[PDB]
Amino acid sequence: SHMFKVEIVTRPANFEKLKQELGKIGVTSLTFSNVHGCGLQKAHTELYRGVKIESNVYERLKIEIVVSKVPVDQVTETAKRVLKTGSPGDGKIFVYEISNTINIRTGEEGPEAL
Amino acid sequence: SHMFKVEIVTRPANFEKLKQELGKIGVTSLTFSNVHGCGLQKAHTELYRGVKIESNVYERLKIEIVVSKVPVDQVTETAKRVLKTGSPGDGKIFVYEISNTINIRTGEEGPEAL
Amino acid sequence: SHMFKVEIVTRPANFEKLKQELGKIGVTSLTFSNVHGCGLQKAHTELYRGVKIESNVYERLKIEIVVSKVPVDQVTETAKRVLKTGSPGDGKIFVYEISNTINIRTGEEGPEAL
Ligand SMILES: [Zn+2]
Ligand SMILES: [Zn+2]
Ligand SMILES: [Zn+2]
Ligand SMILES: [Zn+2]
Ligand SMILES: [Zn+2]
Ligand SMILES: [Zn+2]
Ligand SMILES: [Zn+2]
Ligand SMILES: [Zn+2]
Ligand SMILES: [Zn+2]
Ligand SMILES: [Zn+2]
Ligand SMILES: [Zn+2]
Ligand SMILES: [Zn+2]
Ligand SMILES: [Zn+2]
Ligand SMILES: [Zn+2]
Ligand SMILES: [Zn+2]
């Protein structure tokens, strides 16, 4: 009866295999968009006190999936397998509780709106 | 005293009537952006075992509204009326709890930051 | 052991000083994107009954930071200082609970995925 939002923030490649795999476990829709990632790291300044921050901006794909019947853990596990390449920039996955969902066309609320 | 985020993910039309209606019930600001929606459906392959996923990418408008005094249910109900057209692609509405809000200019926290 | 998402929605300027300050307190990555803000205000119509809504659309920078070890309140306080200019359009900051985080490359969950 819970409802969750799965947020995948990752590298722009491999999207198609994801749609295949998410599709197979029950997901029937999702949203996505391009955003930017920024890495931050403490660097030395010349003085003993000094910190200075170095940063790079890269490309990221943000994918959002809402789920209720389809179990979160099956969504996240599938996301790991498919998007794992070991090389840095594989991204992360965030899970959130949802208080409610409303299907606009039908007017249903809860896991039946999905 | 609760604070909520209302997330409307919908078809790019009808935005103006929404601003009128949300405005009238008390909303004084919101954010929006264009993202993509992806539908996923299980299709037959030629073999008895085989699943294959078919997908379409459409345009979506993401609208975010934070509320405290103005009741969530008045926001969501208004959103339904205005954006309902019966035809598929009417979109959905997601509700989330917010731990806190901070107005950057004034420095206030909670439903007074809004 | 909690995990939080800090969402800063603000004016497109001052981003660099932010990266410096967030970097110094422990943040090693964040995401951002350009979205739109819309102000809504009740205006008079000519008739005694009539409300009419006036709205402006401006530019906004959405910045997302996930934190666990690094304390939310140190993130939000730093965000205030740096982005405060008193003039309207300073933006807001929203805090959310996160049920879980997963590092895709390593496979770790919780505050160790960050
Ligand atoms: Zn989101
Ligand atoms: Zn770019
Ligand atoms: Zn050192
Ligand atoms: Zn040093
Ligand atoms: Zn360097
Ligand atoms: Zn959001
Ligand atoms: Zn497109
Ligand atoms: Zn069949
Ligand atoms: Zn078949
Ligand atoms: Zn077909
Ligand atoms: Zn967000
Ligand atoms: Zn614009
Ligand atoms: Zn008056
Ligand atoms: Zn009047
Ligand atoms: Zn005017």
The continuous run of DSSP H or E covering A98 comes out as: none
Chain B residues within 8 A (CB-CB) of chain A? 4, 9-10, 33-42, 51-53, 55, 60, 62, 76, 79-80, 83-88, 90-97
User: Which chain C residues are closer than 8 Å to B78 by Cβ?
Assistant: none
Nearest-angstrom CA–CA distance, A67 and A57: 31
Burial class (CB in 10 A: 0-12, 13-18, 19+), A13: exposed
* Contact predicate B7/B60, CB 8 Å: no
Q: Please, what is the angle between helix A15-25 and helix A72-83, to 10°?
A: 150
Q: Are B33 and B62 in contact (CB under 8 A)?
A: yes
The number of residues in chain B equals 114
Distance C65 CA to ligand 5 centre (A): 23
Tokens found for residue A45: 């300044």
Query: Scanning the structure block, which residue is given the tokens 């003085």?
Result: A47
The span from the CA of B99 to the CA of C7, in Å, is: 11
CA distance A66 to A107: 17
Alpha helices in A3-94 (DSSP H): 15-25, 72-83
Strand boundaries in chain A, DSSP class E: 4-10, 29-44, 51-67, 92-97, 100-103
Q: Chain A residues with CB inside 8 Å of B36's CB?
A: 31-33
* Burial degree of A96 (CB within 10 A; 0-12, 13-18, 19+): buried
The approach used to solve this structure was X-ray
CA distance C44 to C6: 37
Cross-chain Cβ contact C40/B28 below 8 Å = yes
How is C66-114 classified by DSSP, letter by letter?
EESSS-HHHHHHHHHHHH--SSS---EEEEEE-SEEEETTT--BGGGT-
For residues C51-71, one letter each, b for 16 or more C-beta atoms within 10 angstroms of the residue's C-beta and e for the rest, the string is: eebebeeeebbbbbbbbbebe
Q: What gap in Å lies between CA A79 and CA A11, rounded to an integer?
A: 12
Residue B18 CA to residue A55 CA, distance in Å, equals 40
| Structure-token pair, residue A96 | 């959130």
CA dist B27 and B69 (Å) reads 10
A87 in helix, strand or coil?
coil
Measured between CB atoms, which of C97, C101, C102 is closest to A80?
Answer: C102
Nearest to A38 by CA among C28, C5, C67, C75: C28
Contacts of C84 in chain B (CB under 8 A): 104-105, 107
Which residue, A67, A5, C71, is CA-closest to B96?
A5
Report the amino acid identity of residue A63. Answer: I
One-letter identity of residue B30: L
Considering only the C-alpha atoms of chain C, give the largest distance between any 2 of them, rounded to a whole number of Å. Answer: 64
Per-residue tokens: C36 = 């739109």
| Token pair in block for residue C71 | 């304390």
The CATH number of B1-114 is which of 3.30.70.120, 3.40.50.300, 1.10.1030.10, 3.30.2350.10?
Answer: 3.30.70.120
Resolution of the solved structure (Å): 2.5
Question: A6 to each of A48, A75, A78, A113, B86, how far by Cα in Å?
Answer: 43, 8, 12, 17, 27
Query: How far apart are the C-alpha atoms of B89 and B79, rounded to whole Å?
Result: 14
Interface test with A, best of B14, B55, B68, B82 (most A CBs within 10 A): B55
What 3-state class would DSSP assign to A103?
Answer: strand
Give residues preceding each break in chain C, C–N over 2.5 A: none
Contacts of the segment B70-73: beta carbons below 8 A, 24+ positions apart: B70/B25, B70/B26, B70/B27, B72/B4, B72/B6
The answer to whether A113 contacts B92, with C-beta atoms less than 8 Å apart, is yes
- DSSP string for residues in B46-113: SSTT-EEEEEEEEEEEEEEEEESSS-HHHHHHHHHHHH--SSS---EEEEEE-SEEEETTT--BGGGT
Distance C30 CA to ligand 4 centre (A): 24
Other Cβ atoms less than 10 A from the Cβ of C103: the count is: 17
| CB contact at 8 A, C63 and C16 | no
Buried b (16+ CB within 10 A) or exposed e, B37-64: bbbbeeeeeeeeeeeebebeeeebbbbb
Cβ <8 Å between B94 and A66: yes
Backbone φ and ψ for C3, nearest 5 degrees, come out as -135, 140
Give every CB contact of residue B47 below 8 A, 6+ residues apart in sequence. Answer: none
Q: Are strands C100-103 and C29-44 parallel, antiparallel or unpaired?
A: unpaired
Residues of B with CB under 8 A from a CB of C: 5, 19-20, 22-24, 27-33, 66, 96-105, 107, 113-114
